[PDB]
């Protein structure tokens, strides 16, 4: 039932996650965060209790209200400063097309909550949301804006693609290799995701507002709720957390922190840096000889998974620059220099082998990988 979302169990997770994310931020940076960029997304195969929205509500310092009998969400209640041991953190939410289509009530809940936090009379150090929404509203009014229009526009926190549009708009740009620098990925990401969503209403073209929100963002955040997939076998992560981080870099001149969080065990959320998650998945899966031996029993399909892993690794380097030289070296050695893996791929799926070689050559070309051997360049080019 979409009216019962976020569930109390998704709330408990969102709250613990938000606390752990703030803490990780303070450990990394030595100061309270004031502005995160979150992605809310979904698959038919996800847990359904409303984790993303719960985390966003927790960050801003709002709690859902449930009907005790029915367990439906009836509204929200602002957590007062008396009940906060840290400041409210501003949240800019990028929603996927799936998320936008599936969960209009969640979007409306968050939109109303964050605007209500932005209207509180609280000190800037407790409430950066209100300070931003008041200042932007005031700048718009002083330009001649109708105050009501100005309050509407200053308070937008939910951005997505227009109706009938899916993904972040980067896949073709990366696959055709028709991007010069990361600024071109940021431009496509803004064109694609520049629509503001508010409670009840349809999407509104508001690219300038998205840019202003992203200019403030200090960390990019995305959550994973199961271990049946990872960030190097699905397009859900590079295009949202990856594309959002490219865009913040393009607007500010500094790459923000990216936190790829593990909500697979709801009682024990684990916050990780994207570099940590990348390395966990290379060790655990991509370069894991148990994983390689297993896909070597699935023929054409297995070889395609190897190739896809390299595609995603490249996509993360393209958007974020957070893929270390060691990862590219590791997959080169595991997939190309290991003659048993190389020969498996050449026999069962030579196109997948050619795609892997071509991707590693582009990684060299872009400065994502400097091969430990000079002969690796020629081998890869001769192979592709």
- Answer whether the bond into residue 6 is a cis peptide, omega within 30°: yes
CA distance 53 to 59: 10
Domain range list for the chain: 2-272, 278-383
How many residues comprise the chain? 384
CA distance 179 to 66: 48
The experimental technique used to determine this model is X-ray
User: Each residue of 231-241: b (16+ CB within 10 Å) or e?
Assistant: bbbebbbbbbb
Closest CA to 214 of 189, 181, 182: 189
Cβ-contact 219, 14 below 8 angstroms: no
CA distance 22 to 379: 46
Q: Please name every residue paired with 35 in a beta bridge, in sequence order, or none if there are none.
A: 90
CA distance 299 to 25: 44
CA distance 142 to 166: 37
**Conformation bin of residue 357: beta by default, left when phi > 0, alpha when psi is -120 to 50:** alpha
CA distance 303 to 347: 10
Q: CA separation (Å) from 74 to 69, 124, 246, 353?
A: 12, 29, 37, 54
Q: What is the resolution in angstroms?
A: 2.0
Q: CA separation (Å) from 37 to 223, 246, 279?
A: 12, 12, 23
CA distance 18 to 57: 9
């Amino acid at each position: 039932d979409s009216r019962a979302v976020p569930t109390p169990a998704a709330w408990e997770l969102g709250k613990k996650s938000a606390e752990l994310l703030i803490t990780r931020y303070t450990q990394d940076h030595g100061e309270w965060p004031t502005s995160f960029g979150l992605t809310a997304w979904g698959t038919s195969n996800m847990r359904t209790g409303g984790d993303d929205i719960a985390q966003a509500l927790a960050l801003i310092g709002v709690q859902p209200v449930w009907d005790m009998a029915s367990r439906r969400v009836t509204g929200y209640e602002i957590v007062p400063p008396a009940k906060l041991a840290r400041p409210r953190v501003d949240v800019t939410l990028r929603i996927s097309g799936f998320f936008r289509d599936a969960f209009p009530e969640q979007i409306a809940l968050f939109d109303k909550a964050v605007r209500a936090v932005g209207a509180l009379d609280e000190d800037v150090e407790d409430n950066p949301i209100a300070a931003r929404m008041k200042a932007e509203q005031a700048r718009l009014v002083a330009g001649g804006a109708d105050p009501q229009t100005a309050e509407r526009r200053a308070g937008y926190r939910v951005f997505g693609s227009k109706p009938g549009a899916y993904g972040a708009g980067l896949q073709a740009l990366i696959d055709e290799n028709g991007w010069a620098g990361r600024n071109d990925l940021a431009e496509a990401w803004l064109v694609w995701g520049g629509y503001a969503y508010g409670a009840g209403e349809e999407g509104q073209a508001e690219r300038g507002l998205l840019e202003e929100r992203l200019r403030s963002v200090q960390a990019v955040v995305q959550n994973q709720d199961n271990r049946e997939h990872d960030l190097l076998d699905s397009d859900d992560y590079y295009q949202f957390e990856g594309g959002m981080a490219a865009t913040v870099e393009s607007l500010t001149g500094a790459m923000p922190s990216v936190y790829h969080n593990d909500h697979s065990r709801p009682e024990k959320p684990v916050i990780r840096a994207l570099e940590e998650e990348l390395s966990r998945v290379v060790r655990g899966r991509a370069a894991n000889p148990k994983w390689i031996a297993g896909v070597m029993r699935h023929g054409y399909k297995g070889a395609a998974e190897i190739a896809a892993t390299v595609d995603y690794l490249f996509a993360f380097a393209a958007t974020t620059g957070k893929v270390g030289n060691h990862h590219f070296e590791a997959v080169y050695q595991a997939y190309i220099a290991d003659r048993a893996v190389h020969d498996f791929m050449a026999e069962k799926n030579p196109a997948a082998l050619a795609e892997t070689a071509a991707k590693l050559n582009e990684a060299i070309e872009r400065g994502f990988w400097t091969p430990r051997s000079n002969s690796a360049r020629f081998e890869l080019e001769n192979l592709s």
